[PDB]
Design a protein around this ligand. Structure first.
Ligand SMILES: Nc1ncnc2c1ncn2[C@@H]1O[C@H](COP(=O)(O)OP(=O)(O)OP(=O)(O)O)[C@@H](O)[C@H]1O
Ligand SMILES: Nc1ncnc2c1ncn2[C@@H]1O[C@H](COP(=O)(O)OP(=O)(O)OP(=O)(O)O)[C@@H](O)[C@H]1O
Ligand SMILES: Nc1ncnc2c1ncn2[C@@H]1O[C@H](COP(=O)(O)OP(=O)(O)O)[C@@H](O)[C@H]1O
Ligand SMILES: [Mg+2]
Ligand SMILES: [Mg+2]
Ligand SMILES: [Mg+2]
Ligand SMILES: [Mg+2]
Lengths: 535, 34, 107, 107
């Protein structure tokens, strides 16, 4: 025996999908300290006496603290809260800080090159160790504390039986000196669980109920694990507690005086519907997703009014399949063109959805109301930067002409955005990655003038209804006018020209359906003929 | 070009026996008790 | 003794019912089932909104509902003191009786 | 529900009584939330201030069940003068993006 105990465990303890990080840290540290000393002397190298943990809130750092406190056979860990060493009386803060290391130094003095190791866990280390720049405050307690700790960790005297694990929620507010080599090295980041750690966490937090047979056979763990994405352990535990709470309250009745339905709630089981309701209206991930965008851009579904609608989707599928299985072309772009009010954004969104790329985003002008051009450039750059961290991606930039602020009087637009967009359409991603860019515009000629149409790789048309038969088919598939009304409508449109877009058709039908039954058809025909216009 | 600043003070653990009464302890130990 | 009519907070029904469901539900059911389920209790509530829709009335009446010790109030920033390292002591002096009872009785 | 957003425009010769027929239509609807955004409350404002004011007024309307908003004297919101011509572009872009922004679900 040197330090570790026979029962590695690591599954009963509670720690979940953190395996690679723990193995790597055990590789870097706790390795030179466990080996015949003779070989170490033969190479002649010292140990590492500093570890820093950081990550997004709710990942399991504090739990790791206690588990490490239990998962060792050393003397004992000393855990001290961050902002509890400051004291009012002069000189007491330094006394408190220096009081910690006495045992380790004394033992090293008694047994040099021998003895065990003492581990000190500094929770909320960012509270006391701030930048020593100004602090704009009388007295230098904050500076003195950091200087004293820095002198103790590394100084004229050499200590080799101490290890410090500093856990922080935001590394930005950490002094520069400690992160330098020789003070605190081997800094790890603890991220979110991906797919298997999520299932392990949900199993760890649900073992008890199944132990006592409290989970109905309807519930499936794998379904919940797949459904929930971009969650952190705290979120999973909260979801489980929320489903439990939904049932607990389901078995109770209290309007006037709190009353429990005993002998009616003696048998209690949790159903899948409880989990669905909790996931839908109780717990929402902090990272965020694009459910609202996807459900808002395709508002009234997609229908089949003729041959043209299928061709665009087929070409989009072909382009996606190309970007999947090629190595000579790591970047592909496509442009969607057409007259206004033809449903280009919806078709682009559908094409993007059809593919199952892990990362998808839509950058639309709706989020940049009132921004100057610099902010627009920064936002676009950030979107692309984040899109540059995956093996596959798809970014949809719709309504290009509204990004450049184009107005046909003079004309006038912004140059920085145009140049940034012209450069970001030709930068390949880091080796071994792919990307697909889709653009939506309504004025092809203007773009052709600025010399942007040749940066794109291909263009696909998006026509609108241009024949009476197509209009009749679309009206039938929408299901508003039927029987005699459709007969008269077909009679009026003698297979003549009808240059109307789908959105305008929806609006005209809705506007026509507001009067008494006798006049609906007449109003619809009048509006169609008046606005009907010409190609 | 302006920045108003606030200050925070600290008290001192005044000790009656940190000087001039260690001598009084000696005057109490080595003299009075002797 | 406690009835929703006596507290006179009419106007909010879904909010109060939801709050009662999510927080004051695990402390009503028999005490053995909850143990088996292996669930901790939720500790924390946050209320926000326009100026004067009834946020301090809810706090007061929830405080007066319970059959336990009286609430501890902290009016705004009333925990700031000049001496270095005294605000921390002031805040740390609130969770004092709770720790004592938790360590003494247990569950 | 197919069309949760509808816009209309009143046009005619000057000094004809248009700002006094939008008010009547807005009043007779008996909607819960009604607000008027006129340019006599923004004397001397720069472009950004006008954009922010319009954005705030429009955001106040997304937190109700159904509402009506009046934008009177457009030609003066985005400054215009026949010589040149000259005008503000930020205000025009803000309006042209705000006129096609459906509100949250079901409103
Ligand atoms: N890998 C995991 N295994 C088990 N539980 C986890 C895991 N990750 C997160 N959790 C759960 O979520 C919480 C993780 O947060 P924890 O209590 O460790 O505080 P923290 O993340 O250090 O907080 P802060 O970010 O403020 O420092 C715990 O309640 C824990 O049960
Ligand atoms: N086959 C279809 N293809 C596209 N849109 C359809 C189809 N059938 C019905 N629609 C409806 O038409 C809408 C298309 O118009 P949309 O809201 O996408 O604006 P748009 O064409 O991008 O407008 P603009 O170019 O003026 O910005 C779709 O959201 C959907 O509501
Ligand atoms: N839902 C309500 N039912 C009854 N009275 C209310 C309600 N909301 C506010 N009030 C009245 O408002 C006053 C208290 O409001 P207050 O709690 O101060 O609101 P806030 O703290 O949000 O400003 C009292 O006169 C109270 O009767
Ligand atoms: Mg913690
Ligand atoms: Mg469009
Ligand atoms: Mg108040
Ligand atoms: Mg007028």
């Amino acid at each position: 025996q040197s330090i570790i105990n026979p029962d590695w465990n690591f599954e009963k303890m509670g720690i979940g999908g953190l395996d690679k990080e723990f193995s790597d840290i055990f590789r870097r540290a706790f390795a030179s300290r466990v080996f015949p000393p003779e070989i170490v002397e033969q190479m002649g190298c010292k140990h590492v006496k500093g570890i820093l943990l950081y990550g997004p809130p709710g990942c399991g750092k504090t739990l790791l603290a206690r588990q490490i406190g239990k998962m060792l056979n050393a003397r004992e860990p000393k855990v001290v809260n961050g902002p509890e060493i400051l004291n009012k009386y002069v000189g007491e803060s330094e006394a408190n800080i220096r009081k910690l290391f006495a045992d380790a130094e004394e033992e090293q003095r008694r047994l040099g090159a021998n003895s065990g190791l003492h581990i000190i866990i500094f929770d909320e280390i960012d509270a006391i160790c701030k930048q020593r720049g100004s602090m704009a405050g009388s007295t230098g307690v904050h500076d003195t504390v950091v200087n004293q700790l820095l002198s103790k960790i590394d100084g004229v005297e050499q200590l080799n039986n101490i290890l410090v694990i500093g856990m922080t929620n935001r590394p930005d507010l950490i002094d520069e000196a400690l992160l330098r080599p020789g003070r605190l090295e081997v800094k790890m980041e603890i991220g979110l669980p991906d797919e298997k750690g999520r299932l392990q966490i949900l199993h760890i937090h649900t073992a008890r109920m199944r132990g006592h047979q409290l989970l109905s056979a309807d519930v499936d763990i794998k379904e919940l694990a797949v459904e929930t994405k971009n969650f952190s352990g705290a979120e999973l535990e909260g979801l489980v507690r929320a489903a439990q709470s939904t049932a607990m309250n389901r078995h109770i009745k209290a309007s006037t005086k709190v009353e429990v339905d005993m002998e009616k709630a003696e048998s209690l089981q949790v159903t899948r519907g409880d989990f669905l309701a909790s996931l839908e209206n109780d717990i929402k991930p902090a990272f965020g997703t694009n459910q609202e965008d996807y459900a808002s851009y395709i508002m009234n579904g997609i229908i089949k009014w003729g041959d043209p609608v299928t061709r665009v989707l087929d070409d989009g599928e072909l382009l996606v399949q190309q970007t999947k299985n090629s190595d000579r072309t790591p970047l592909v772009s496509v442009l969607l063109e057409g007259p206004p009010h033809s449903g280009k954004t919806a078709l682009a969104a559908k094409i993007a959805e059809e593919s199952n790329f892990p990362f998808i985003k839509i950058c639309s002008p709706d989020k940049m109301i009132g921004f100057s051009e610099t902010a627009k450039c920064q936002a676009m750059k950030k979107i692309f930067d984040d899109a540059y961290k995956s093996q596959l991606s798809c970014v949809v930039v719709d309504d290009i002409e509204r990004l450049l602020d184009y107005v046909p009087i003079g004309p006038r637009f912004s140059n920085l955005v145009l140049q940034a967009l012209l450069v970001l359409l030709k930068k390949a991603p880091p080796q071994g990655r792919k990307l697909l860019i889709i653009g939506t515009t309504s004025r092809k000629d203007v773009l052709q003038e600025m010399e942007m149409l040749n940066a794109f790789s291909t263009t696909i048309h998006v026509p609108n209804i241009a024949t009476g038969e197509q209009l009749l088919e679309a009206l039938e598939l929408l299901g508003n006018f039927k029987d005699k009304e459709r007969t008269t409508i077909a009679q009026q449109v003698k297979g003549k020209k009808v240059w109307i877009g789908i959105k305008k058709l929806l609006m005209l039908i809705e506007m026509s359906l507001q009067m008494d039954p006798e006049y609906r058809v007449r109003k619809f025909l009048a509006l169609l003929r008046e606005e009907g216009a010409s190609p | 070009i302006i920045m108003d600043s606030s200050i925070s003070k600290q008290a001192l653990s005044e000790i009656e026996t940190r000087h001039s009464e260690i001598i009084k302890l000696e005057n109490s130990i080595r003299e009075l008790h002797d």
